[PDB]
Design a protein around this ligand. Structure first.
Ligand SMILES: Nc1ccn([C@H]2CC[C@@H](COP(=O)(O)OP(=O)(O)OP(=O)(O)O)O2)c(=O)n1
Ligand SMILES: [Mg+2]
Ligand SMILES: [Mg+2]
Ligand code: NA
Length: 351
DNA sequence: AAAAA
DNA sequence: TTTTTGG
DNA sequence: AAAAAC
């Protein structure tokens, strides 16, 4: 007969071939509105419903189709019913016409602007980016200044040839200071995505000392600053503790990507958002798993570990509360096995 | 908002 | 019913 | 020291 679809993204295979985009585009909009209205509960319920539909191997064409699918309560089934009716969501249409929603989308599209700043600007009466940028009283963070200066490039999204060009630059800068270092692209591109808002990398070295591990991101970014390629840089020192804003040493960057490096109407360069993460060699599988994503896959991995296995998972470790021991892993497959989960390939984590 | 405690 | 929802 | 990144 059939198998039961789990409520956990970590127990589903989600590939990029989405047969239910009509439903998930509507659910993504309704979730985003609840995120903006700080209704965390309703937001998460629409995110989970969107996630589960993305895992289906077929399109929903009737309400009978939704039987046995978890994460679809009465409210969500009303939304699906409405889309089956006319091909549109009246609920999502009303959100798209809402002035608070339109302003939040527009303002947060700027690097450096999140929910609090977007809400502040809206309550001040600002509706356009032109009126924000030209205001003489407003004060902008260094992140927002970079967000406005490179807006058109950052708003456009990175493609695979650009991501590969960035990978080459990262690898050649990293091996200059740590020749045995392992550089892995993570993030959407590792999950098989054609585009992304940024390019993320995990860096680890089997030999390097603590001090060498600490200095790598500083050495690599100076090197780029010397070449005039570092457009923005923010290095966060590690808040990870060997024995919970807890993270590995990382940096949020904007790099100048010369067009010649990508395999010229305007300047032969594009501003690219790049994130680098340095982790100790023994925690490389936990970091890789945390940074591969998707965000929904990571949420559910942690939720499943806690509620179903009485385990605690994060980007640095896996702890078993019953056995009172930290579980160690040399690969992602070993983490899945510790959790009692079937291995989900990176391209199947697009939840 | 949905599911579990 | 109240609590949880990654943390 | 809230905020923005994960
Ligand atoms: N809230 C989040 C955000 C991210 N991550 C992990 C999973 C993905 C990874 C990347 O951060 P993003 O770059 O925003 O992820 P993305 O998957 O690469 O999507 P996009 O490529 O379009 O930015 O970090 C996480 O555990 N929790
Ligand atoms: Mg990314
Ligand atoms: Mg990123
Ligand atoms: Na932003």
């Amino acid at each position: 007969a059939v198998k039961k679809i789990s409520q956990y993204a970590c127990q589903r295979r989600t590939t990029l071939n989405n047969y239910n985009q009509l439903f998930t585009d509507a659910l993504d909009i309704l979730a985003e509105n609840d995120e903006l209205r700080e209704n965390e509960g309703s937001c998460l319920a629409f995110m989970r419903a969107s996630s589960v539909l993305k895992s289906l191997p077929f399109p929903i064409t009737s309400m009978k189709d939704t039987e046995g699918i978890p994460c679809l309560g009465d409210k969500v089934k009303s939304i699906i019913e409405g889309i089956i009716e006319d091909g549109e969501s009246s609920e999502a249409k009303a959100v798209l016409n809402d002035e608070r929603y339109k302003s939040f989308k527009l303002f947060t599209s700027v690097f450096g602007v999140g929910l609090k700043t977007a809400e502040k600007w809206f309550r001040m009466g600002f509706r356009t980016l032109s009126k924000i940028q030209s205001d003489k009283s407003l004060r902008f963070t260094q992140m927002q200044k970079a967000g406005f200066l490179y807006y058109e490039d950052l708003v456009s999204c990175v493609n695979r040839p650009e991501a590969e060009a960035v990978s080459m630059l990262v690898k050649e800068a990293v091996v200059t200071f740590l020749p045995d270092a392992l550089v892995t692209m993570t993030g959407g591109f590792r999950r098989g995505k054609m585009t992304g808002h940024d390019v993320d990398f995990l860096i680890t070295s089997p030999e390097a000392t603590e001090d060498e591990e600490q200095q790598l991101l500083h050495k690599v970014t100076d090197f780029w600053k010397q070449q005039g390629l570092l457009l923005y840089c923010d290095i966060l020192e590690s808040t990870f503790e060997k024995f919970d804003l807890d993270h590995f040493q990382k940096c949020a960057l904007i790099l100048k990507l010369d067009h010649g490096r990508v395999h010229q109407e305007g300047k032969g360069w594009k501003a690219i958002r790049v994130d680098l993460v340095m982790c100790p060699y023994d925690r490389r599988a936990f970091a890789l798993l945390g940074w591969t994503g998707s965000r929904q896959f990571e949420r559910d991995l942690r939720r499943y570990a806690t509620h179903e296995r009485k385990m605690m998972l994060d980007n640095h470790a896996l702890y078993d509360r019953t056995k009172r021991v930290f579980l160690e892993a040399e690969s992602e497959e070993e983490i899945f096995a510790h959790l009692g989960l079937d291995y989900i390939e990176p391209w199947e984590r697009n939840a």
